[PDB]
């Protein structure tokens, strides 16, 4: 035919001469024989590979905290290099001017606050010379570093879930068949405050789902731990850091149309004041583009 170039041998044969005509895929061996965990999942500690790449400072802005950084999918961000790239055109590397920590508007964390989410790169579209390079380039790829920091006292209580969901596709707020609007899934830096669930939530213009339990996409919380995440417990730690590489099928995508990440912050346990009289605490998010690349320069896609 063809072939190709308790233990059972077999003659490898393609009867139809082709790959992909072949049957199902097993694990071969050349000689006789005679795995349990995947550390890439489970969100390693960024020391669980190496710490030489990291006191955290990218591009003229400083973070002082880094054994508790989670390295998403155990992969460190890196430039597209070659041989994985489509175009031969040399990408632009802004480096320290567009790779830096951008701190967003703080959000009050109250009793009854259901959650918040930010889409990335979208949140950064107006931020600095990163947000300029989005519009003037066809494509782009970036890794990010999300530093989420919420400080209360020893009298306060309550926990957050800080998760980064690749390709978080929102559900429409209910009923009929509608695509969520371009504007409601691209909120800007302000992100989206989850105000639901209720039967009274407005349904118009494709508004996204407001239910935090189903992750707005229809999958439970508590399974949200399969993504890169940290749990901020005000009894233990006040802050969070997550290092995400560039996750996508494509080497570079548009960055205006496609949001390849989501930063979701869910008050897993509510905020209870202690003997203190403080009913709400700010949550602040600081995003650093890291190892960002841009190609296909044009006129600003800005309207």
């Amino acid at each position: 035919g063809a072939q190709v170039s308790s233990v059972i041998k077999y003659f490898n044969i393609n009867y139809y001469k082709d790959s992909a005509s072949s049957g199902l895929s097993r694990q071969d061996f050349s000689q006789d024989p005679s795995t349990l965990t995947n550390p890439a999942l489970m969100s390693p500690s960024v020391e669980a590979c190496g710490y030489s790449d990291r006191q955290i400072t990218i591009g003229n802005s400083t973070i002082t905290t880094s054994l508790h950084t989670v390295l998403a999918y155990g992969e460190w961000p890196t430039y597209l290099s070659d041989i994985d790239a489509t175009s031969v055109d040399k990408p632009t590397h802004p480096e320290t001017s567009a790779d830096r920590f951008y701190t967003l508007d703080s959000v009050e964390w109250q009793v009854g606050s259901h959650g918040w989410w930010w889409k990335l790169p979208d949140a950064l579209k107006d931020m600095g010379v990163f947000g300029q390079n989005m519009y003037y380039h066809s494509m782009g790829r970036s890794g990010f570093i999300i530093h989420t920091q919420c400080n209360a006292t020893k009298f306060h209580s309550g926990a957050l879930i800080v998760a980064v969901i690749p390709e978080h596709q929102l559900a429409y707020v209910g009923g009929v068949k509608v695509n969520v609007g371009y504007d409601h899934t691209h909120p800007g830096q302000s992100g989206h405050q989850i105000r639901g669930p209720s039967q009274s939530n407005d349904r118009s213009g494709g508004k996204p789902d407001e239910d935090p339990l189903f992750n707005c996409n229809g999958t439970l919380l508590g399974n949200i731990t399969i993504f890169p995440h940290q749990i901020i417990n005000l009894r233990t730690n006040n802050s969070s850091t997550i290092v995400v590489p560039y996750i996508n099928c494509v080497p570079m995508d548009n960055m205006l149309k496609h949001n390849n990440l989501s930063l979701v912050i869910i008050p897993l346990v509510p905020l209870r004041p202690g003997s203190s009289g403080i009913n709400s605490v700010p949550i602040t998010v600081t995003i650093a583009p890291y190892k960002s690349e841009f190609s296909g320069a044009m006129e600003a896609q800005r309207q």
Binding site: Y16, S21, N38, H114, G158, L213, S275
Partner: protein, 235 residues
Amino acid sequence: GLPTRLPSGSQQFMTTEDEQSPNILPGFHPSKKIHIPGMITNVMHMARVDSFIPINNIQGEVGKVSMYYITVTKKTVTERILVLPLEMSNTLFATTLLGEVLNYYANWSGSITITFMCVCDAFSTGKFLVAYTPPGGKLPEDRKQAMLGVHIIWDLGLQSSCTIVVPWISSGFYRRTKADSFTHGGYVSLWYQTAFVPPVSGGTGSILATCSACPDMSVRMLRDSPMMEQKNELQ
């Protein structure tokens, strides 16, 4: 020419068989395969990831985020705080990454790993008894009967003591995913070792619990998960 024979099961079509097939679209060139972060080669590695158990599922709390946490206060006498009957078909486990990977398979083996996390202030302190009663035992009803099984003392101010590893104690080699009296796996219950002492009287604790597989977990006989149902066509 050559004397071939066609036995029984020749012209069969078996869903689960393995056979080569002709390629429509020959010479087709697949787009190149780049390096995408996060490759998963086996679906048990999802079961390995901690996931919160909906330990509070009752009339009002189901469908809300409050379904994941239990309230503990200071009490004069020990109480039984929580019971997690050990079954992968039960809403507690069935809805997690562990339980919903294991509901595709008709039976399993190995150790569950249950971690508890208390959300309270820094001034609160507590001692909890986490006890696993093996197969064949009754649910304890009092702490002196719960302590006689596998148990760990979970102390706040450590968070190295949270995780209890449900051992594999079974007659047979595998345990059926769907709860039945023959293979039933036992009970994990939570008790007050001493007390939950708040910084001020009337204080309140809040307890979360996660479950994941141990590296010796194994499953077999893939089947239809009860965790999905299609009652009308998708359009």
